[PDB]
């Protein structure tokens, strides 16, 4: 049924933050919070990006600002990030944080640890991207995380995010 798309929610226990993640990473898309790159990069051209929890690379851009990704540098290996779709909570664990140049489009490849691959991805990653350093845009801070758990919503919210209440729709 038109329009058919869903949004997701992102939760970060470590910074005590969460958002509805919109589609797209244009200036109007991420004006007020994080957005999902709709396409992943490959050497042979752009392909549809992974949806939440799915094999590939669910990549997100957000401004380096108080209400969004200012504190992304506080994430360390092992930290949990939770992505929520209409059916599940997906827990990812941070496996890497690094700094790259603005043109390092490889970080949004379906497998960011093998960006030259042309094969279908098998692992599910989550990537968070923002400007770096603070108050500069010379570089990008990148956090990659790997799926460790899929929890159907029928079982309720994970304890570490259960206090992060909405104000009022992921689906039409």
Q: H/E/C letters for each residue in 37-95?
A: CCEEEECCEEEECCCCCCCEEEEEECCCCCCCCHHHHHCCCCCEEEEECCCEEEEEEEE
The interface mask with Cl ion, positions 120-149, x = CB under 5 A, is: -------------xx---------------
- Whichever of 22 and 108 has its CB closer to Na ion, that residue is 22
Binding mask 96-135 for a copy of itself (x = CB under 8 A): ------xxxx-xx--------------------x------
Partner interacting with residue 169 (select from Na ion, Cl ion, a copy of itself, none; CB below 5-8 Å by kind): a copy of itself
CA Rg, the chain, in Å? 15
In whole angstroms, give the CA distance from residue 172 to residue 170: 7
Between 47 and 149, CB nearer to a copy of itself = 47
Q: State the DSSP code for 139.
A: E
Q: How many residues bind a copy of itself (CB under 8 A)?
A: 37
């Amino acid at each position: 049924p038109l329009p058919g798309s869903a949004n997701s929610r992102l939760y970060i226990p470590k910074t005590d933050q969460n958002w509805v993640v919109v589609s797209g990473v244009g200036p109007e898309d991420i004006k007020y919070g994080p957005g999902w790159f709709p396409e992943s990069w490959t050497p042979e051209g752009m392909v549809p990006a992974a949806r939440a929890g799915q094999p590939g690379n669910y990549a997100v851009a957000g401004h380096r600002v108080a209400a969004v990704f200012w504190d992304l540098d506080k994430l360390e290996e092992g930290d949990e990030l939770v992505l929520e779709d209409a059916e599940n909570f997906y827990t990812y664990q941070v496996v890497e944080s690094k700094v790259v140049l603005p043109n390092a489009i490889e970080v949004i490849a379906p497998d960011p640890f093998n960006p030259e691959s042309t094969e279908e991805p098998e692992k599910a990653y989550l990537t968070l991207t923002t400007c770096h350093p603070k108050l500069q845009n010379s570089h990008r801070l990148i956090v990659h995380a790997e799926l460790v758990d899929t929890r159907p919503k029928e079982r309720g919210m994970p304890d570490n995010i259960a206090h992060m209440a909405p104000e009022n729709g992921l689906e039409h």
